């Protein structure tokens, strides 16, 4: 972008400054008030989002809830009362929803659509006129791929 000459003081003495690692521009951008003189119209960015650990399913014949071995194995090894004080439930007591199965055919697809981009994570909405839907916006919005020429980066 186009832009929107300092004397030697007691304050900017380079004999007082320890030069160990070079300070860059992204240090000024991530922390706008620590390393910046005259920080006029900066905006405070988002800090951090927790790591979404969603793992994609490649085989439809596998069950929807499965120990996918990208997950690391858990290492294996309390006031438990005795069996003599016999607690007995009434006969009509059941666990909840025992007739329904644990997973169906639409379970893994329903979980995979929960982490879909807009509007594929939705199930209802309004229509949009066809010239207001960019199809290229993510592609130049993400980053530049490696090995591209100069003019494509520009």
């Amino acid at each position: 972008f186009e832009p929107l000459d300092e004397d030697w003081n007691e304050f900017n003495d380079i004999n007082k400054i320890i030069i160990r690692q070079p300070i860059r521009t992204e240090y000024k951008i991530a922390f706008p008030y620590l390393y910046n003189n005259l920080p006029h119209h900066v905006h405070l960015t988002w800090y951090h989002t927790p790591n979404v650990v969603f793992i994609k399913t490649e085989d439809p014949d596998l069950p929807a809830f499965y120990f996918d071995p990208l997950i690391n194995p858990i290492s294996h090894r309390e006031p438990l009362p005795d069996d003599d004080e016999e607690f007995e439930l009434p006969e009509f007591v059941e666990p909840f929803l025992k007739d329904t199965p644990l997973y169906t055919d639409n379970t893994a697809n329903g979980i995979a659509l929960l982490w879909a981009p807009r509007p594929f994570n939705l199930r209802s909405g309004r229509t949009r006129r066809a010239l207001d839907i960019p199809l290229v916006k993510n592609w130049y919005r993400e980053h530049c791929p490696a090995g591209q020429p100069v003019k494509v980066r520009v």
Partner: protein, 47 residues
């Protein structure tokens, strides 16, 4: 501490002589995620 229809090469950014930033070490995302549009067999070859 102290007309031209093309774009010129002097307008370029990311000309930085850093070992961390030239090789930015892109992600592959658990061997499951894919970069969109670039060919999937070619992405499985360059992993």
């Amino acid at each position: 501490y102290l007309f031209v229809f093309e774009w010129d090469a002097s307008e370029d950014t990311s000309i930085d002589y850093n070992p961390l930033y030239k090789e930015r070490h892109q992600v592959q995302l658990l061997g499951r995620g894919f970069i969109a549009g670039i060919d999937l067999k070619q992405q499985k070859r360059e992993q």
